[PDB]
From Swiss-Prot:
UniProt lineage: Viruses, Monodnaviria, Shotokuvirae, Cossaviricota, Quintoviricetes
Gene: NS1
Subunit structure: Homooligomer; when bound to DNA. Interacts with human SYNCRIP. Interacts with host transcription factor SP1; this interaction allows high levels of viral P38 promoter transactivation by NS1.
Chain ranges for the short sequence motif RCR-3 as given in the UniProt record: 205-209
Comment on protein domains: In the N-terminus, the endonuclease region is involved in binding to the origin of replication. In the middle, there are the ATPase and helicase activities. The C-terminus probably contains a transactivation domain.
Region (Ori-binding): 186-190
Identification of the protein by name: Initiator protein NS1
Signal peptide: none
Region (DNA-binding): 1-248
Compartments in which it is found: Host nucleus
Family classification: Belongs to the parvoviruses initiator protein NS1 family.
Organism field: Murine minute virus (strain MVM prototype) (MVM)
Job of this protein: Multifunctional protein which displays endonuclease and helicase activities required for initiating and directing viral DNA replication. Also plays a role in viral packaging and transactivation of several promoters. Binds site-specifically to 2-3 approximate tandem copies of the tetranucleotide 5'TGGT3' within the origins of replication (Ori), unwinds this hairpin region and nicks one DNA strand thereby initiating the rolling circle replication (RCR). Cooperatively binds Ori with host PIF and probably other host factors, which activate the nickase function of NS1.
Length: 248
């Protein structure tokens, strides 16, 4: 019952029923003119001040949440790429907030990087607040995908011709490398944005995942999480499960 565990539980419980959007930021494998662009082909560390700061935040979140009782054999390249993506995902969120003139302190958000059985790396984002409404979900997805595709093409470490960069940009947008949770439907039928409950989804779902400690990653595991209150960031796996238990 450390203050950190109690503090996270209390913070989430207060936001138990806050409606938020659910996004997934991802990438897919691409081959352009014989050039392979895989999930971890975006390893440029761009020297923009905010991005550098965000990447440092991810590194330190990883460092503080690491359990040293057990050894961790995650590949260095994998960690690097995840830290970079954490900075890029956040940069996208912050750019859209700026477009809407939303004060960052008026926003609740949660970010969690995972490795899926079939898709591999992806990043969940829950985001909402008083300045957000369900009808804005589709606009948010589109804007986030614009910024996400733009930053990915900038961060790509594969030498690309201008035509190739533009093609990659178009692929990331056309194939919706940012997804928005909607109610189940038909291809022809309309899709409705499905808002989720912030604290509940975090405590009863995201905090239940198993920590990735190996390469290749365990199917369905998580790498790293963070939130707008810096509450879950530094928690070890065992502490996260304690939060879920207390939250109930
Ligand atoms: Mn997932």
């Amino acid at each position: 019952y450390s203050d950190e565990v109690l503090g996270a539980t209390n913070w989430l419980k207060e936001k138990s029923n806050q409606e938020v959007f659910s996004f997934v930021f991802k990438n897919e494998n691409v081959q352009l003119n014989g050039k392979d662009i895989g999930w971890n082909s975006y390893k440029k560390e761009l020297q923009e001040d905010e991005l550098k700061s965000l990447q440092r935040g991810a590194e330190t979140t990883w460092d503080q949440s690491e359990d040293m009782e057990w050894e961790t054999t995650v590949d260095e390249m994998t960690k690097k790429q995840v830290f970079i993506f954490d900075s890029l995902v956040k940069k996208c969120l912050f750019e859209v907030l700026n477009t809407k003139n939303i004060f960052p302190g008026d926003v609740n958000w949660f970010v969690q990087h995972e490795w899926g059985k079939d898709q591999g790396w992806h990043c969940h984002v829950l985001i909402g607040g008083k300045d957000f409404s369900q009808a804005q979900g589709k606009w948010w997805r589109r804007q986030l995908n614009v910024y996400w595709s733009r930053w990915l093409v900038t961060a790509c470490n594969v030498q690309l011709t201008p035509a190739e960069r533009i093609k990659l940009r178009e692929i990331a947008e056309d194939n919706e490398w940012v997804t928005l949770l909607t109610y189940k439907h038909k291809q022809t039928k309309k899709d409705y944005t499905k808002c989720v409950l912030f604290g509940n989804m975090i405590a009863y779902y995201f905090l239940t995942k198993k920590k990735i400690s190996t390469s290749p990653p365990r199917d369905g595991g998580y790498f790293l999480s963070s939130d707008s209150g810096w509450k879950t960031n530094f928690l070890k796996e065992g502490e996260r499960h304690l939060v879920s238990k207390l939250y109930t």
